[PDB]
Amino acid sequence: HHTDPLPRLPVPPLQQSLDHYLKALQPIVSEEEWAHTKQLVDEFQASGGVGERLQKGLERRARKTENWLSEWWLKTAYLQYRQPVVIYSSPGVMLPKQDFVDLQGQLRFAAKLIEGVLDFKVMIDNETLPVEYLGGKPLCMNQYYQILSSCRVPGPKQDTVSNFSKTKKPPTHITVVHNYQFFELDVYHSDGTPLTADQIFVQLEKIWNSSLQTNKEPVGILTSNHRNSWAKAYNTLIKDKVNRDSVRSIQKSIFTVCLDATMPRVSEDVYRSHVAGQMLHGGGSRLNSGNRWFDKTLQFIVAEDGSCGLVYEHAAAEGPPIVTLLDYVIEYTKKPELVRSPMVPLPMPKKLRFNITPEIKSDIEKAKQNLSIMIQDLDITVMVFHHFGKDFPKSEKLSPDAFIQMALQLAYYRIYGQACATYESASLRMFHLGRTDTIRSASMDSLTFVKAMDDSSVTEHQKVELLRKAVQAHRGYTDRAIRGEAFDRHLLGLKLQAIEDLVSTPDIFMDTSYAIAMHFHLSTSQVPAKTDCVMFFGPVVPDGYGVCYNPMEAHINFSLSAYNSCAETNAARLAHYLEKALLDMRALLQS
Numbered sequence: 001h002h003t004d005p006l007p008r009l010p011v012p013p014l015q016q017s018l019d020h021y022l023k024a025l026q027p028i029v030s031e032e033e034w035a036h037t038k039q040l041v042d043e044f045q046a047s048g049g050v051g052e053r054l055q056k057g058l059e060r061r062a063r064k065t066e067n068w069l070s071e072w073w074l075k076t077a078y079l080q081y082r083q084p085v086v087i088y089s090s091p092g093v094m095l096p097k098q099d100f101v102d103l104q105g106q107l108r109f110a111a112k113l114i115e116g117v118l119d120f121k122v123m124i125d126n127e128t129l130p131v132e133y134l135g136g137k138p139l140c141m142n143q144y145y146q147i148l149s150s151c152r153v154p155g156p157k158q159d160t161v162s163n164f165s166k167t168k169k170p171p172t173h174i175t176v177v178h179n180y181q182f183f184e185l186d187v188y189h190s191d192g193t194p195l196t197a198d199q200i201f202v203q204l205e206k207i208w209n210s211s212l213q214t215n216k217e218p219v220g221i222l223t224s225n226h227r228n229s230w231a232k233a234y235n236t237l238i239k240d241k242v243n244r245d246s247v248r249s250i251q252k253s254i255f256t257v258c259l260d261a262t263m264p265r266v267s268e269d270v271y272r273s274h275v276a277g278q279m280l281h282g283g284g285s286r287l288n289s290g291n292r293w294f295d296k297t298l299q300f301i302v303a304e305d306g307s308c309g310l311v312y313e314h315a316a317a318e319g320p321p322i323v324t325l326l327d328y329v330i331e332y333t334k335k336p337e338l339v340r341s342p343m344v345p346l347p348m349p350k351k352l353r354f355n356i357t358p359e360i361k362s363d364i365e366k367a368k369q370n371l372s373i374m375i376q377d378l379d380i381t382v383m384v385f386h387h388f389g390k391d392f393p394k395s396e397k398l399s400p401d402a403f404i405q406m407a408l409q410l411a412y413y414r415i416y417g418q419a420c421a422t423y424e425s426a427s428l429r430m431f432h433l434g435r436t437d438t439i440r441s442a443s444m445d446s447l448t449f450v451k452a453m454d455d456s457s458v459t460e461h462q463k464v465e466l467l468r469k470a471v472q473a474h475r476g477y478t479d480r481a482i483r484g485e486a487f488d489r490h491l492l493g494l495k496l497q498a499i500e501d502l503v504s505t506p507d508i509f510m511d512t513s514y515a516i517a518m519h520f521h522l523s524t525s526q527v528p529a530k531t532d533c534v535m536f537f538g539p540v541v542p543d544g545y546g547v548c549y550n551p552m553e554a555h556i557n558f559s560l561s562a563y564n565s566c567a568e569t570n571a572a573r574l575a576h577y578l579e580k581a582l583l584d585m586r587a588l589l590q591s
């Protein structure tokens with residue numbers, strides 16, 4: 001007894017996408033590049049040309065697959081991408097800081113966290129998750145079955161994702177890591193009932209007392225390295241039988257819990273952003289970065305000072321399902337405990353040891369060095385925008401997300417004097433196995449709006465009109481992307497279809513304009529959550545920013561990242577300008 005299957009991801013018409021492409025280039029390429037590109041696009045879609053053939057191939061593909069894009073996207077965005085997953089790929093989440101002030105409180109909370117994960121897991125194992133809906137239509141729930149009991153596995157050419165969640169006898173253990181030492185924690189009794197919060201606590205105390213030592217090699221930091229380096233250190237590491245079993249238990253574990261040491265000083269105004277770094281990368285090879293296995297799809301982190309969150313491996317996951325999980329887990333942690341499984345003898349959780357050799361020690365040192373370089377190059381800021389949230393744009397009958405996106409467009413322009421390639425993530429969950437597509441926030445509408453906004457010679461009435469029209473156009477683009485009518489994945493599909501067809505890369509993809517279009521100086525996503533949390537990730541280009549936010553009713557949590565390698569970007573500076581742009585838009589509309 002079930003409802004019908006979801007629609008399949010559509011292949012958009014070629015002309016509809018190339019026109020949208022040409023529309024989207026206008027604000028970010030020169031007059032001369034635009035005209036060249038239009039000629040290129042004309043040769044491309046020409047009757048009897050390269051583009052028509054590639055489009056028939058996609059149409060073919062969609063007929064033969066459940067989702068024409070899914071393998072391609074997994075592979076090109078993640079598994080064949082060989083930069084470290086840390087910062088460049090795995091997004092982190094920072095929770096409100098918890099109350100606890102002593103180890104009991106810390107391990108109690110971790111205990112409840114684990115209980116909540118296992119409760120959510122019931123619906124996962126059973127496939128009884130309440131289906132999520134959008135606009136009265138159901139959304140694909142497939143991503144929720146790719147989060148637990150899974151792990152990325154390094155490979156020589158590309159990586160893979162192992163999922164043990166539906167094996168004949170699925171894992172019943174989690175892994176816990178503390179002072180770089182990993183432990184296998186069984187979280188179900190022989191009868192298949194979960195341990196209780198109290199039983200989890202007792203076991204965590206054993207794990208804590210078994211890992212007090214701080215001079216153990218941080219093997220886990222190897223997972224933070226370039227994927228080709230890590231693929232090599234990985235094979236070295238698991239030559240040893242014990243080492244292999246330890247990795248194995250980590251990879252198979254339902255999820256990982258990191259019991260973090262507290263960070264250094266921090267200015268007291270640089271804190272929120274230091275904790276964000278802690279969640280994203282660990283803070284450094286001397287800090288918690290080796291208290292981690294970055295291949296693990298789900299890592300929860302509980303620090304000594306109350307600082308909490310997670311970091312997730314992105315390859316098969318997206319933000320919203322991860323924060324649904326998180327929202328559930330946190331709200332579980334505040335529910336009354338009801339039924340206390342009877343006292344029983346509890347075994348000693350197994351410490352998962354590593355035999356280190358001079359070689360493994362050398363990989364570790366090299367990994368510490370690489371990570372230090374990455375962390376040192378990362379500029380991240382967290383801004384809480386307190387003046388308003390969804391409430392204000394809602395009162396103006398404007399989409400709050402489109403409003404925020406236009407504010408960011410305005411900020412960028414006030415700093416840089418021009419528009420830039422901007423990505424906003426769109427969820428394609430209305431379709432079977434759908435992941436994401438690209439909303440392009442820089443448009444002639446936004447450009448006209450931002451150029452006019454500070455022009456003393458334009459009337460306020462004119463400015464308001466252009467504002468409402470930029471915001472509303474962005475909402476239109478947003479809704480089209482979510483219905484499968486955007487073009488970026490379609491263009492990527494055309495390119496990959498070319499490789500399939502044994503032809504060279506089409507000229508439109510080697511053009512001037514396409515690199516500029518694909519070079520996102522602003523890489524963004526809205527990730528709404530019931531919990532007052534924020535998500536963050538690194539920029540996708542050396543000279544760009546990563547922007548992620550959680551709009552609540554009366555405030556908005558923002559994170560912004562940049563690389564220090566590029567003196568012209570400054571996360572905190574963009575954050576200030578973004579605060580001012582939101583303020584200036586509300587003021588303009590209310591005058």
Ligand SMILES: C[N+](C)(C)C[C@H](O)CC(=O)O
Binds near residue numbers: 319424426436437
């Ligand atoms: C972080 N960012 C926007 C680069 C990627 C999103 O998390 C996922 C996506 O849009 O595919």
